[PDB]
Structure formats: C-alpha cells, structure tokens
Amino acid sequence: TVFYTSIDIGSRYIKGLVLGKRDQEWEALAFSSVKSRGLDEGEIKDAIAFKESVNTLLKELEEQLQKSLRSDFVISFSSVSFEREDTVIERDFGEEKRSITLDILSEMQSEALEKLKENGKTPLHIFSKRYLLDDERIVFNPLDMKASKIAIEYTSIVVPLKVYEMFYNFLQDTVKSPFQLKSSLVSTAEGVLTTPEKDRGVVVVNLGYNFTGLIAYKNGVPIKISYVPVGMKHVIKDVSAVLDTSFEESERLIITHGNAVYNDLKEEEIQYRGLDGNTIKTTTAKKLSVIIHARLREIMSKSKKFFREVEAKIVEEGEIGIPGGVVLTGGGAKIPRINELATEVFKSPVRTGCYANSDRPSIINADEVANDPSFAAAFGNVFAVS
C-alpha cells in the first residue's frame, strides 16, 4: 500500500485529498477545502499566511484520517507564467549500434532539464514529443532498441526558476515529507479528460479565481497553454461595485443565487448586507445574473481566441474542428447554466469536467469530490502526462 496526499493550492481555496493505492485499487481516505491566504497573482505575498492556510488543511485531513499515516505529497499551483518549451537532446555514438537503456534516457532527460535551467526555467512536467533513431525512424519508446544515434524532442510545461524556488522552499518548510510540484492546469486536464479527447483534440477552460487558464491536448499531450487575465475575482468585484457590498457578501451572493443565463429569470428578491455588515439591502436574482453575465461572456469570448488558435493547429493534423470541444473546470464551472452560455459563445460541444466524468480509475469513497469540478487538479496530481 502506498499513500498520497495531493494538494492543489488555489489563490482562493486550497484543496486536499489523501489517497491509498494497493494493486490496481484506489481509495479516498480524506478530503477538504480551506480558504487560501497569502497567495495573489500567482505569487506568495505572505509566506506566513500561506503556511498557516496550508497547515489548516493538513489539520483537517489528519482529523479525518484519525491516524498519522506517512504519505508522499504532490502539490499543484496556478500561475499565468506557465509556458510550453521544446528542447532537443541528441546523442551520437558514432559508428557502432548500442542498446538504448534507462541510463541513457535518464541522462538525456537530465540534460534537457539543465538546458531549460540555463534559460532560467524549471519544468513541472516533461515528456517526449518524438524519439528519432539514426536520423531515420520515429519510435514511441526507444527502450532496448539499437541505434547509432538518438535524438529526443521534449515538450515541457515550465515556470520561471524563481517561481519554482519560492514554492519549493516554502512547501518543504511546511510539508515535512518528500514532495513533487505540478501545474494545477496540467493536473486539471489529467483529472478530467478522457483518452479519446486527449488524443483527437480538446480544450480545457479553467474558470479560476485570479484568471482563466486555457490548455489544449492533442495526441495525448498538452499542445498549447495560456490564460485570460479575467477570472471569478472580477465577477465578484463587479457585483461588489454595483451593490456596494463587501467582497465576501458578493461571493456569497454569486455562489448562492448566481445564474449564467438571465433572460428567462423571475424577479425573486434576495437579501444581503451593506458594507456596515448590518444594514439589510434587497435586489433580485435576475439583477445579480445580469452583472455576472457580462463578465462571464467576456471570459468566454477571450477564451474563444485560444480555441480558434488551437483549432488551426489541430486542423493541420487532419482533424475537422476540435473534436472534443470544450471542457469547463474550476470554480466558475459550478455556476448554473454556464455550459449553455459557453455553447452560445464557442458554438461547440461543452461539458463540465470532474474526475467522475474522466475515464480514470474509480476511487472508492471518492464520490463527493469526484463530482466536483474544483477538485479536478487534486485528482489529476496523482496521474502523469501520457
């Protein structure tokens, strides 16, 4: 039995999941979400507040287990500074043929790591985009083959070295166990997509708090990664501005009553407190949905630029359109009727992403969070890119 603690560090919530694996079998042992403190705009802005928020989650998880289990950690975070980088590493053995070994592959991959580091970048995910043996044949796994020459093109999802170091050092400090750091957006895609979507082409739109993350898959791997710098935080701010209420009351209103489609709504009255925390004010669910709307149309319209960019890259491989359409994830994916709005914008199939609707293995007792789009990355963290 191996145990994993997966943590997905968002700028509004930190989510955690403890899993156990035996043979082919997985079970969920604990899960929770806490308020995030000290992160903003993809950066730790208050390390002491960050540490305490993380600690608060670990304490919940341990109360659920009732046992002080050892596990290995996998921890993901979001950032607008994720980028895709391509690196080629070549080994020429001259005249003789030799067996390609785990040693040779491990060394070539170390080399690609150093080449990205020399360029001030650290990969959170690295995989091979192509193996080429003797300048003439493409293989998918070169292990035990014979070649005089091997070239490997790696695709990496990287962040700046200094971003990596800050997270690594604070986390090591807090988590007192071996850990690996990952991209929340890559792990979201791994937690929610099916294998035929990842192979034939699909776009994940992550409706997060500080910004909307965008990632596209083809041939089983990420082919493009980007963002729109407008997220649920701006929707919250719009409501707080029109109603004159606190950030917290505006988010409560959105989560409680928000709808992405307003044009058929009744004028149901809803109540909230003004900034003095005391006066009761009144609006309608329709009116709240009118605010929400404009900003969500904005986010989906700017994400459509990325969708069309991908659609061009995918059509070059002989696909018609992006066959998988759009999968919506993150907190904003829980707004009622968001898929209806996204379908009007994208003119494409749109579904909600969650671990339950991927084709990943059933996890015993995981249902409550397997069905939650904001837990996708927490699951995806325990799986790797093809």
Residues annotated within the binding site are 11-13, 15, 78, 209, 251, 331
Q: How many residues bind Mg ion (CB under 5 A)?
A: 3
> How far is 134 from 151, CA to CA, in rounded Å?
8
- CB-nearer residue toward ligand AGS: 197 or 372: 372
Binding at 226: pick from ligand AGS, Mg ion, none (beta carbon under 5-8 Å per type): none
* Among 5, 6, 9, 10, contact with Mg ion (rule: CB under 5 A): 10
- Residue ranges of the binding site for ATP: 11-13, 15, 78, 209, 251, 331
CB of 173 to ligand AGS, least distance (A): 20
Torsion sign over Cα 317, 80, 78, 248: negative
* Among 5, 6, 12, 376, contact with ligand AGS (rule: CB under 6 A): 12
CB of 303 to ligand AGS, least distance (A): 14
Contact 339, 327 (CB under 8 A): no
* Among 50, 154, 167, 209, contact with ligand AGS (rule: CB under 6 A): 209
**How many CB atoms are closer than 10 A to CB 327?**
30
The phi and psi torsions of 132 (rounded to 5 degrees) equal -120, 120
193 binds ligand AGS (CB under 6 A): no
191 binds ligand AGS (CB under 6 A): no
Buried b (16+ CB within 10 A) or exposed e, 231-247: bbbbbbebbbeebebbe
208 binds ligand AGS (CB under 6 A): yes
- CB-nearer residue toward Mg ion: 5 or 184: 184
208 binds Mg ion (CB under 5 A): yes
CB of 12 to ligand AGS, least distance (A): 3
- CB-nearer residue toward ligand AGS: 91 or 273: 273
Contact 9, 16 (CB under 8 A): no
Residue whose beta carbon is closest to Mg ion = 10
38 binds Mg ion (CB under 5 A): no
Centroid of chain to Cα 42: 13
255 binds ligand AGS (CB under 6 A): yes
Binding at 352: pick from ligand AGS, Mg ion, none (beta carbon under 5-8 Å per type): none
* Among 5, 6, 11, 71, contact with ligand AGS (rule: CB under 6 A): 11
Residue with the two structure tokens 């785990």? 102
Distances 263 to 225, 247, 266, 286, 345 between C-alpha atoms, Å = 34, 26, 9, 8, 16
- CB-nearer residue toward ligand AGS: 58 or 147: 58
> How far is 332 from 204, CA to CA, in rounded Å?
13
225 binds ligand AGS (CB under 6 A): no
- CB-nearer residue toward ligand AGS: 86 or 368: 368
CB of 228 to ligand AGS, least distance (A): 11
Contact 38, 45 (CB under 8 A): yes
Which residues, 326 to 345, sit near ligand AGS by CB under 6 A? 330-332, 334-335
Query: What x-and-dash track marks residues 178-207 binding Mg ion by CB under 5 A?
Result: ------x-----------------------
Query: What x-and-dash track marks residues 72-101 binding ligand AGS by CB under 6 A?
Result: ------x-----------------------
Query: Angle at Cα 103 formed by Cα 100 and Cα 107, nearest 5°?
Result: 105
Residues that bind ligand AGS (CB under 6 A): 10-13, 36, 78, 184, 208-211, 231-232, 236, 251, 254-255, 258, 330-332, 334-335, 374
Residues at the interface with Mg ion (CB under 5 A): 10, 184, 208
